[model samples]
Target chain A: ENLYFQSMIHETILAIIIAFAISALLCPIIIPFLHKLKFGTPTMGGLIILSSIIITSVFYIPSYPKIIPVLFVTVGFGIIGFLDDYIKIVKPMQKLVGQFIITGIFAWYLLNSGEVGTDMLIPFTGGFDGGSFLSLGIFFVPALFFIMLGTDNGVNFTDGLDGLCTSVTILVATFLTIVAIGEDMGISPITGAVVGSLLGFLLFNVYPAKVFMGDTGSLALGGFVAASCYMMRMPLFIPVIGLIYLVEVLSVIIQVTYFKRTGGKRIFKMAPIHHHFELCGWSETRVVAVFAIVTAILCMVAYLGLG
Target chain B: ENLYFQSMIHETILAIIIAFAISALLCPIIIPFLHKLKFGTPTMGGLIILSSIIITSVFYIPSYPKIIPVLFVTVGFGIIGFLDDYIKIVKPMQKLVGQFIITGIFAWYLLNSGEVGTDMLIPFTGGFDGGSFLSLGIFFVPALFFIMLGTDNGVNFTDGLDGLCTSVTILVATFLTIVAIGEDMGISPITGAVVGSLLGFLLFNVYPAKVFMGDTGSLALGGFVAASCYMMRMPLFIPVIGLIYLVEVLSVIIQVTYFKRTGGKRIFKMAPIHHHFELCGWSETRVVAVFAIVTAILCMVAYLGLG
Candidate 1:
């Protein structure tokens, strides 16, 4: 018999409930106090969301050791993000280095702790390539580091859109919950808590806008995705299911790279691609819906071709 | 091995993509055309939602005969709802007869078709209470008809609120997808299509609010739930999962029944209960968000204990 939270069909639903309820309830109580503290708009809602995840994570970490590392990394990343928000250091490289050290440690642990291995799994060639377990040997850590680094910022950039990141991440984590179930990773509880808190936070985040996500929410979210994927040897599917993240970050890269080459003529008409869509006549809400729907589609492809 | 669409981990992802993509694309082009005709607000997005379901259903019906009957019932019910919306008769009695005749035929087909039986499943006592195969005997047809009829109106009344119905239905169909997978029922494709289209229609529905669900979408949605549950022998779980529907319909019944019995006294501030929350100082979107979140909570309860 499988453990309850390990299966998508089991306690993942309960995890979201606890996470959603706690985050939603905490929003008005916490974010408003932050606003009174002259912190910012409810935009700093990530603290509340992260708290919900921590609460839910604590419920399972003792019994399910797999959740232990993810809980560690998410909060580790949360501290990095919250510092960027509250301290307002405005240092891009500062946050980058912090992410590097944190996720670098995560990548190392995932590779060396014997929880996961260097053998990778890619699409279509899922079971076939590299003897059903693609070996990167020593390249595994570096490859994972870059992948984790890119995805963390991929989510970070995507977060700066119109209620876009949470909805997309909700769908992303739902797929990941199913992924956790399939791998028997005993970590769906951690993934489940991410979605649950987001849903609850969505209550505060959407509708008259009591709050928004920060580098706090985004980086912690990225931590959740990266840690879970690497633990399951599913780092490769990140670009596939996290396609929006890739496109968002890539638009930034492409937009900048082409800027000097073409004498400051930008490629996308803007960056993040959410902005590009708006310049192309997409409404803020329309951009979110389409992006979320496409994420669902890509998750389908990812699930369909899973190894 | 299970069929692709039968498993949530399988082709349900594909089904949602097709359904979500088609519905999202159709909303912009078609809804404005309806607006030009002075038909209504962007709220009539139900026709577009239905079309996506039909198209996706057509994709599977030939090979998967189970989807055939569900396709039949959903479209069959969609006709009644569209009439209720478009005909402008505004006669509740007329729509009532139509729903009865339609679902009555469905009940007979399901009971006699050998596709599903009358074995009932309620919560907690799932495996123990009714000999592990609860038999309703000859009363099965009447029971099935009433269940379908009530669920249709249950959704119908819930549709009157602020984006409450679609959001609630999305979560409901999601859990239904899991239930179908659990029961080995080969009908998750249809349930997946409902969520996909709803998520897509929600694009047109929410965010600058292009459209809304008419009785057309509501009845069709209810039909999908009723037929699938009956087909899966899980009708008993409807009240647990569809608690919002039950409460909404019960509010109407009590509001009306108590009016005459107590010389026009009402239990709530208003009927349909969504209005009651508004009267109680709940903002419209707040009412919707809270209602949806509660439904999410209930689905978890249904999934865990019912299993």
Candidate 2:
């Protein structure tokens, strides 16, 4: 057990480092290429880098020894995100539907891959049987769908600020890496890889951001988070660990609901929680700093809560 | 067991409702009182209201309730915060020191009162010992200092936007309420009260705000969270539940550290996580919404992690 734990931690850390280096190095070239193709802005490219990292991380998860799958997924998702960025993807709704399909496919693969419900480490509940394989199948499919789609949109929606979503996501992924190891699950390495990529991306993604993660990165990043948590039976932990993303989505929901009902009334001077603070005269660094502090505390607390 | 569980849940729900009502009613009175005292501006009042709600809620922990002591402490601290908000405190550091002292007193009381480390309900932890009176006595000084001062400053730091801190704090308190009940701790009522007060405050607190909570409220609010969590033996949980707040504080730390090291260079255009988004061009609402959703999600995830 001790050896297993140590190896998990070591591999997880290694994966993160590799993923980070690859994503960071690839972002400049990938982003510019998308921009030349008239994809969104640099922001879109940032999204691609993140998504590619996430997707590549997933594809490479089962085959831990091979770095090739990680590379392929990163490049593959990068191209896909780049395409979506440049072509506009038939409007946001259609694009989202398309994303759902892709995520759904990936989720299905995860479910069928034989590791879907292996660990069953639900907090407070001890280890769940995951019921029978049939029951597990039912649970795995939708769970994976939600995780992938949720993560995809969470990253995208939070992209309202320049480096806010990207950097914060990096922090979250880093925390996730800790969680994966602490839990001693096999998937920690994949999470580490994603964390690594995001960390490198943060160098360019911070304020005066040179590039954005675009949809490519966002979708893949989201999927990675969702899948990792789901695999660990800790999907429920996302709310606390990933509070920033939840806030972003809720603001849109509240704004739309509040506005439509009130007929032109608005919830904030803007929508999405981050922008509201900005409108209130706070400087950008102030907002991000405050938010990051909150994230760190939340991550820390979650760590303790595990005990 | 079932009966105990049911009653606990019912009591918690009732307490939450009652607390909300009380806080809502208290707000109008408090607002006027602060106004009569010539602290009526949204910024000042808003911070005070928010802080007071948190303070009052924290001190009201059922196991250690001493209305007189709690009230006295609250009022004394409220005044301290008010003075600072009024610009009479002169130095920010002085104000922070004052907060530390006040919170320290509260912690001393908590220690002597024998509420620290008493076993409180938490999900997987079973009936593990919390801060024993003896152990608490050892930690009381620093714990109170941190809760009173750290949390107070944290909320204050995050209070730049209309609904930002208020929304996030409320969400956090709401989660605390749930966890309190789920853990079968007896402090659910206090959590309820804080939640209620925060909700009412948020009514005025959100967007195009009327009155702010000011330092009076912010300090009090921070104190309340610290005290409540302390009572719950979940001091460790605050960082997770208040992840956004952690991020905010971290940003400042990182900025100051970076700036000091770099000799006048800044990590962000501004400090605190929220303003970073603003500088990145996100709208005020977007920032808050994103954060709010994130907080809610994180809270939920943390709750699950608790399980």
Candidate 3:
């Protein structure tokens, strides 16, 4: 038993290191190639992350069933994001429809797989399943659809500033990784792979960002985090752990709602609290650090409450 | 047995939350009062952190023996730092002598405690317990003193930018906290308290500075981290886990050594790599984030290695 646990740990570490190395090494090659192609500076960086995860997981296929859904959701949404980025420069509106359709199909698979249930754990109530009180029933598919779509867009919206989305995604993924390990849920290596790839990506994504993750990276991460949490039966913790993403979405919502109601009077100097901080004279880096710190703390709280 | 572990986890969580709340709440009251004293912008902010830790630990003192040396080194060096910061603005050269004397006394206490051993774990060698040829014997006292003093000054040097030291210290403290938990070393709450307090402090310390930890906070943090690792018998992991601190100190040493050897030619735009980065065009927040990220990753490596 001890050896088994030790081997599991060894595999997890190997997965992370391999993923990090591949992604880090791929950046220089990809960045300059994209520049030459005039890809408008938003390269499809998520491809490297997706590729790294897939390559690393291939060696440890004994964890196949567990790896499949995570890979499916991550890659499935990554394709949609890649199309979105592709269309934004060349062609635009169709990407949203593509995102919804792809996510809906993935959600359908999740609903049928018995991995996620209609029942959800209520926070701070000692595991009293909340599904009874707020069951989705047949609406579960659409609900899951909205979750995946919302998270994708939420993460996408937060990606406006350098390293904002990458940093927050790293934190959220890390939170889920902790949940995976703590629950012995057998998905630690998968989560660890995401973390390692993001950390490597962050090397270039921080302020004066060398390359943007674009919608390609952001949307896939959104799906990845949402799918992982839902599959772990801890979907309810997503809001708390992904609080920054929600805040970003909320700022836009509040801004739009208030603008329509108040006839152009503004609430913040700008929407997406990060931009608001920037307009209020905070440096971009300061805003990013503050948002990341808040996300980290909230993720910790979510872990403590649920893990 | 299960219930015992659950209860221990609960207490650890409570201690952390309480420490966080106390330190966070105290910041507003303390910040304004210090401002009134015209104590410059950077008052002894670490005093609040130290106070918060002491206050939190007092209510749960079952682990007195473990807590004693940790508290002794922390408070003792904090006093030295307080004096250093005090003399820097008020009186200045005397601070060095004061730091050495105080650190020497604490090192003596640690050496006599018998908690720390001559044998140390060499990294990546599978716990062979390296000691035979490398044993310090009577030299252990001076070795401990240098570790303590070096870390104190290293952390002090790193504090040149706002939030740099605070963020790195938080990461180091967090890394030590995880080690304590993983090893079941009876020091989690103490480490947890440091994590909580540092989080609270970072809220005000981040960029375009509100207040500085000054020497008071940095020296204390340096001592706290060094002592924690030593007490946990993980002193060898310090250079890896606290890599940023080591880097900062080494940058200064290398720059000074090269300057003297070459008759005044400089290496780097400035010493203490944070300043070098800043001079090289990295923003303060970016430098802080980069250093924090590196510290976080290295600490993860240290944890993977030792834990």
Candidate 4:
């Protein structure tokens, strides 16, 4: 059993390296093809991420049962996001209902998989048995639904700037990777694969981005983040790990709420604080640097808490 | 013994986290201070790196005796680089003799310390018994001198663009971390500490860089890279892991050798291929991205060979 476990670790490391290589090599071909096709530089880049994960997971399906459901949710949301991207450019509409349905189905799959538990970790509190609020039970499905939707849209909102969402997702995945390693959980390779793929994507996606990850990539990452946290039994800490996403979502929520309460009075010059920073005279790269720095710090805090 | 090993691993992880935190916190203050001192945008940033390693190693000294010489060589070369940087701005003179004396002293120290092994791993050919080209023996001192000088200068040249050398060093350090983990060697924490510190530096060093790492930072890193590999029993692979540094150094060599041979005819539009790429119309960030991608790939190959 010990030998088998060590081999699994080796395979996972190989998967990470392979995933990064594949995504990086594919981008050069994909980016130019999309450009030639005049696809507005957003040609379902999530497919690169989806393909990388699928290829990596194939190497260790038996060792990690969680891969089945995680991939299911990841690719499922990726397709929904693909449709959203397709409709936005090729047609012109939102796939809200379609996203809702896909998220619900995946949430249902997660609750039934026995991979995610009934209890969630309450942040800043020591005990697992914090209270009844810790045990989601039947509420787990709806909670998952809302969590997935919020994270997907939050990441989408954060994607407004070059490399913003991608950088934040890398931090989120890195935190999860650390958590998985600490726990010795079987899902580390998947998190490692996510980190590897996103880093490859970031090489092209940093400021002066060669390609936009679009809704397709953002939403797939959202699903990956939410699902990975759930599998790791630290769903509550999701907000801490994905703090930039939370801030983005919260900014929108606050803006809409304040506008409703005060008859269009504005809090931020714009919703999604990244835009607010830009309007306040910070450049896009500056905003990205600051946001990414905050994400790194927060992830370190989460790692400390994990110990 | 197993419990002791696990405890050391725990200490190492804590050291990494603490090192990252300290360097990151120091940069905001350091950048502005250096700027106010009229020290140009790059002012002895290697001090930040040097300080972080010393602080971190202080916490882990008893667990790893190798830390002593590694720290000695790192700071020794860092001070030499510091003097070089200081003279360039404050006095405008080369410090070649100073550098040579410092490097020779440390090389002698490593030879006598018995921390670095005599045998080296040659690329792609397996067997520790691969012969004595693998063994530096008495030649170790000159080899260390040349290696340290070459690496320090090589990394200094690659720092032509914002965050270029810094990013490549992070990749190189990360690969070393992987090797250290694979070997179950005690130096993983030091490699980890290097990675953590560089990452913090990169936050401010990325394009539109707030502060330059200058000679202070690059030379320290070059020494760190050389010393780390020697301690890991893989000094020969330094060229492979530090391939970008090698490429930059070789470009200068080829440019100089060719220029003299052909009466000033040049190979690249400019020496140091980052400049060549920029001359060919790639943006600074693009050159950095591409160079970093190549570095990441080479490091992965190095990791594969280590296994």
Best TM-score among the predictions, by candidate number: 3
lDDT of 2: 0.61
TM-score of chain B of 1: 0.92
| CAPRI classification of candidate 1 | acceptable
Q: Which scores better on lDDT, 2 or 4? A: 4
Clashing pairs in 4: none
Each candidate's DockQ: 0.44, 0.03, 0.37, 0.29
Candidates ranked by DockQ: 1, 3, 4, 2
* Tens-digit lDDT string for candidate 3 (B1-307): 5455556666676677778788878988888876765543757788888889899877766653577778777888788777766666662356567777766776677666676555556666553332222356787767776776677778888888877888888788877766676566667788878888887777778766677785788877787887787777676787898888888889999999999999799898999888888888886666876787688777767756742
Query: On residues B76-158, what C-alpha lDDT tens digit does candidate 2 reach at each position?
Result: 66777777778732277798778767766775676567644533234334233332222444554665566456566777788
Query: What's the lDDT for residue A224 in model 4?
Result: 84
Candidate 4 C-alpha lDDT tens digits along A46-103: 7787788888877778877777767777787788787776666662134567668777
Decide which is better by TM-score, 1 or 4.
1
TM-scores for chain A over all candidates? 0.93, 0.79, 0.91, 0.90
Per-model CA lDDT versus the true structure:
0.78, 0.61, 0.75, 0.75
RMSD of 4: 3.7
Ten-residue segment with the worst summed lDDT in candidate 3 chain B? B125-134
lDDT (Cα, tens digit) per residue for candidate 2, span A157-250: 8776655765576667667666666555555566666666666666566555667666766655665566566655666667777888777777
| Model 3 root mean square deviation, Cα atoms | 3.1
Measured over all alpha carbons after superposition, the RMSD of each candidate to the real structure, in angstroms, is 3.4, 10.7, 3.1, 3.7
lDDT of 4: 0.75
CAPRI-style class, candidate 4:
acceptable
